[PDB]
Amino acid sequence: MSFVKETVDKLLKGYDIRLRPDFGGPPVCVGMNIDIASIDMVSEVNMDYTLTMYFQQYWRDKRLAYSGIPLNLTLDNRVADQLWVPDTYFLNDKKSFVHGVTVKNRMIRLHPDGTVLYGLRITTTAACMMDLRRYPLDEQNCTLEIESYGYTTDDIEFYWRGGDKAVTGVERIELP
Amino acid sequence: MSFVKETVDKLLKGYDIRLRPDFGGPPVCVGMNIDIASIDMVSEVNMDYTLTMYFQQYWRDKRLAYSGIPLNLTLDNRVADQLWVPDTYFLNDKKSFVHGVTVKNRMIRLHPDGTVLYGLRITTTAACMMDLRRYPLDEQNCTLEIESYGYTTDDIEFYWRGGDKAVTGVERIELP
Amino acid sequence: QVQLVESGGLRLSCAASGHTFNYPIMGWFRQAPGKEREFVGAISWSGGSTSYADSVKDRFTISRDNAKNTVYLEMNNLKPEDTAVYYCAAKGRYSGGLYYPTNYDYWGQGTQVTV
Amino acid sequence: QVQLVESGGGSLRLSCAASGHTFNYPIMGWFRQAPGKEREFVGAISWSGGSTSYADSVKDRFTISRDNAKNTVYLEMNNLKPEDTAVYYCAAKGRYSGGLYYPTNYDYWGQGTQVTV
Amino acid sequence: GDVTVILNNLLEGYDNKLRPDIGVKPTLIHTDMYVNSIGPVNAINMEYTIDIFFAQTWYDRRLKFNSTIKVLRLNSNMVGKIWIPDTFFRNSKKADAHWITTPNRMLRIWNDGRVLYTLRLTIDAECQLQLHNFP
Ligand SMILES: *[C@@H]1O[C@H](CO)[C@@H](O[C@@H]2O[C@H](CO)[C@@H](O[C@@H]3O[C@H](CO[C@H]4O[C@H](CO[C@H]5O[C@H](CO)[C@@H](O)[C@H](O)[C@@H]5O)[C@@H](O)[C@H](O[C@H]5O[C@H](CO)[C@@H](O)[C@H](O)[C@@H]5O)[C@@H]4O)[C@@H](O)[C@H](O[C@H]4O[C@H](CO)[C@@H](O)[C@H](O)[C@@H]4O)[C@@H]3O)[C@H](O)[C@H]2NC(C)=O)[C@H](O)[C@H]1NC(C)=O
Ligand SMILES: *[C@@H]1O[C@H](CO)[C@@H](O[C@@H]2O[C@H](CO)[C@@H](O)[C@H](O)[C@H]2NC(C)=O)[C@H](O)[C@H]1NC(C)=O
Known part of the structure; x- marks a missing residue:
């Protein structure tokens, strides 16, 4: 427990949250x-649709590499504020939010090779232009x-991580 | 004129916000x-009613007793963030808030006997049943x-402070 | 613009004429010679809610009607201390408490009653 | 899956017709490539056919119109110049694709019609 | 009665980014739920509303205090400094935690090490309906 705490402190000590992994480089x-998770509403009057998902992103940061701990540290969600994350956004979105019950629905997991996994439960009202001529x-x-x-x-x-198998759960969606 | 600042500072000094008044006492x-103030909406479909009111809570705390200035000091709203208050809540509030224009509608008035009169301007959509059989x-x-x-x-x-006169403003209500 | 005309020697009556909707709550006050006005009671626009002072509880009652004369005060168990002039008064919607006379505007003509 | 066919080529009137999922590729535009030169933007037009946008080098002497009953865009020419000789191409672009002036954002291209003046 | 010293000693060696038993065993959590009311069942949006008092009990073996008092309640400002589980409702579409007159949440720690975290919530979950035999 002391070793893990000191390792986490060392990883977060002297860390800048302001330079991408391998800043000068590829x-x-x-x-x-x-x-x-579900596709709830599909409104033609507004020409949009509501979609709930477990967005997940994976990158490799050598600054968060640790050794001697043979397990995948699933850290508390608030540490996402103390680490660099991508600035990804949905371009065709009209309104979206991250669920915050019981806490912020967020995930940070640091593998021992620097591979960071970052997860968010997101609901988005994405625009869907429609052609109701037929x-x-x-x-x-x-x-x-x-x-x-x-x-x-x-x-x-x-x-897309996993090729065509990146997006799952589409088969289980039952639209009315 | 300046002495009031030191008086309120000494009142704040030593206060334990995490401890109720008379922790070991009765x-x-x-x-x-x-x-x-008013009950604007009463929805049968939603089974609720929106109610706006001024909620006063009066309690005796010995830790905030001052002397030398018997004028009842009415402090700014922000002091509410640095004081103990009851955990009072409404069981039926489906959705409720405190009005926040121009500033947060809140008031605290420390009378010289140590008591505190917390005040809040609250709107709440309280959940009510309505037996529509008749x-x-x-x-x-x-x-x-x-x-x-x-x-x-x-x-x-x-x-209820003041006995049956605790609630004042019922006559001001009118509904269509 | 509200004009209050009240009558009474017993059932006191008060008639409000004008933009009565803008002044929903209306009430009765009392004053004896050498004394200050004191709150007697109040009635709201709906008429299903009332307010009375402790000194006149269970004895005096107030009621509301449609049309013009929408304030009636029924007096029971009179006492010599009740000798006074009673004023009809009206108050705006968003105003202070009923008990304080200064919140009222468009006062009526006080009717004198001597037990 | 949209297929484009270009026709035509002082006063000229090219007509680029489209067939397939045209609604998926509404923003339809015209480029031109002079011989030995890089491809350049000439014009663009939206689905409703009322949001034309032309490059500054070909402004005030070009016009673009659209019709959806027969899915086609007409490029109407005016007083030309010797530099206007080129192979004119017609391309389509999908909603939420990017800028108009760059050809890489366009997916389905036409065969290209040669014009010489 | 020397409660402040106990309170600030509990939070000295604490690290809120590591769960109890980080590399020993899974952290067992016991859940309690009191269904106050099952709100209207929206048959158009295929959803329903429920109001629950949700309580979670676990054992944290770094929050031990040896004193005569065997239970301490922490204000809502300290619940964000202790490690709480990240439980979430999978089928929820819009869940809310009430906030007035104070944050309607509670955190209690016993001397032995037990921690109880209680919260009131109004969830709006999805109840995808098979309406082939309506009504
Ligand atoms: C619902 O409707 C929407 C309507 O928009 C529809 O969307 C289109 O869907 C189709 C698929 O059905 C998309 O088409 C494909 O595009 C693929 C990506 O193309 C880009 O990348 C090409 C290079 O590959 C690299 O791409 C990135 C680079 O960082 C990365 O993944 C890799 O490095 C990778 O190597 C690039 O060449 C291409 O460029 C276009 O334009 C240039 C000229 O400007 C031209 O040279 C290219 O040919 C190309 O047209 C583009 O920038 C593409 O890979 C894919 O290719 C397949 O086709 C080739 C044959 O062409 C096969 O050999 C190969 O094995 C694959 O089968 C395919 O072309 C299209 O882009 C969508 N539209 C938009 C606007 O995004 C949905 O499909 C509909 N869905 C449903 C369910 O109805
Ligand atoms: C501060 O407020 C208190 C609370 O009202 C005041 O005390 C009283 O004033 C009322 C109204 O006149 C009387 O009915 C009470 O008898 C008074 N005493 C008590 C104990 O309530 C007090 O006078 C105020 N002092 C200020 C503003 O300096």
Whole structure:
């Protein structure tokens, strides 16, 4: 217990939350996957839809590498404020929030190779433009667009973790 | 003129915000007053009613007793963040808040005998049942239920200050 | 703009004329010679709620009606200390407590009653 | 999945027609490549056909119109210059794709019609 | 009665970023729930509302105080300094914790080490309906 506490203190001591992993170097690759809990509302009058998900992101930070502890430290969520995280945002979103009951629905897990896992339970009202010219004999294309706000491809790179199996839970959705 | 600053500072000095008045002594007596403003909405579908009121809580604390200035000192709202207050809450409040324009509607007045008169401007959508078996020939009974959260009767005691005149403002109510 | 005209020698009556809606709560005060006005009672716009002072509890009652004369005061168990002039008064919606006379505007013409 | 076919090519009127999931690719634009030169932006138009935007080098002498009953965009020309000779291409872009002036954000291109003046 | 010294000694060696028994065994938590009311069952939005008093008890073996008093209640300002479980309701769509007149939450610590965390919540959970046989 003392060893783990001192290791965590050492990792968080002398840490800057203001430089991406490998600041001067190749761009940091962030692997992301989603678990769709439900798709609740699909409003044609507003042309949008509500979607709840377990967003999860993975990156590799050598600054948070520890040795001698053979386990994956799942830290308290508040440590996310003390660590660098991507500035990912949903481009076609109209309103979204992170659930805060019983606490902030957030996840930080530091693997011993520097691999940081960051999780958030997010509800988003994403815009979905619709073509109701054949209504009710219509087939829509709704989309969710995920993008880095400040950084560019020379600094941050995105990829779907697990290929086509990144997004799960779509099969279990029962829309009315 | 300047002496009041040192007086209030000495009142603050030594105070333990985490300890109730007379921790080892008998339970603290807390009187309550409710000045009703209005009941704007009464929804049968939602089974609730929105009520606005001024909630006064009066309790005797020996730790805040001053001398040399018998004028009742009315302090700014921010002092409420640095003092002990009861944990009083409403059991039926489906959704409630305290009005915050221009500043937080709150007041504390420390009379020279040590007592404190906390005041709050509260809106609350209290949950009420309505037996619509006789609707629209029906008569409803709607109650606001005030109760302590953690403290038992051995720690805190509730009573209506002023007896039957505790609630003043019922005549000001009118509904369509 | 409210004009109060009250009558009474016993059932005291008060008639309010004008923009009576803007002054919903209306009440009765009393004053004897050499004394200050004292709150007797109050009635609200709905009429289903009342307010009386402790000194006149269980004895004097107040009621409301539609049309113009919407304030009636029923007097029972008169006493010699009740010898006084009684004033009808009206108050605005958003105003202070009923007990304080200065909150009232558009006072009526006091009717004298001597037991 | 949208397929584009370009027709036409002093007064000219090109007509780029589209077939397929046109609603998925509403923002339809025209580029031109002079021989030996890089591709450049010429014009763009939205789904409703009332939000035209032209490059400064080809302003006040070009026009773009759209019709959806027959899914087509018409590029109407005016007094030309010798530099206007080029292969004119027609491309489509999806909502939430990026800027107009860059060709990499456009997915489905046309074959390109040669014009010489 | 020397409660302040006990209170500030409990929080001296504490680290809120590490759960109890970080590398020994799983932290066992016992849950209690008092269903006050099951709000309206919205059949259009496929959801329902429930109000519950949710209490969670566990054992934290670094919050031991040896004193005559065998139970201490901490204010709402200190519950954010002790390690609490990160429990969340999976099927919730919009959950709220009430806040007036004070934050409606409680935290009690016993001398032996037991910690009880109590909260009042109004959850709006999803109840996806199979309405083939309505009404
Ligand atoms: C609902 O409707 C929406 C409507 O928008 C619809 O969206 C489109 O969906 C299709 C798929 O069905 C998308 O098409 C694909 O695009 C893939 C990505 O293309 C980009 O990247 C290409 C290079 O690959 C690299 O990409 C990144 C770079 O950082 C990274 O992943 C890797 O490094 C990777 O190597 C790039 O070439 C491409 O460029 C386009 O334009 C250039 C010219 O400007 C041209 O040269 C390219 O050919 C290309 O058109 C682009 O920037 C792409 O990889 C994928 O390719 C497959 O096709 C190739 C053959 O072309 C196969 O060989 C290969 O094995 C794959 O099968 C495919 O083309 C399309 O982009 C979406 N539209 C938008 C606007 O995003 C949804 O599909 C609909 N869904 C449902 C369920 O209805
Ligand atoms: C401070 O407030 C107290 C509380 O009212 C005042 O005390 C009383 O004033 C009322 C109203 O006139 C009397 O009915 C009471 O008899 C008074 N005494 C008590 C113990 O309530 C007090 O006078 C005020 N002092 C100030 C403002 O300097």
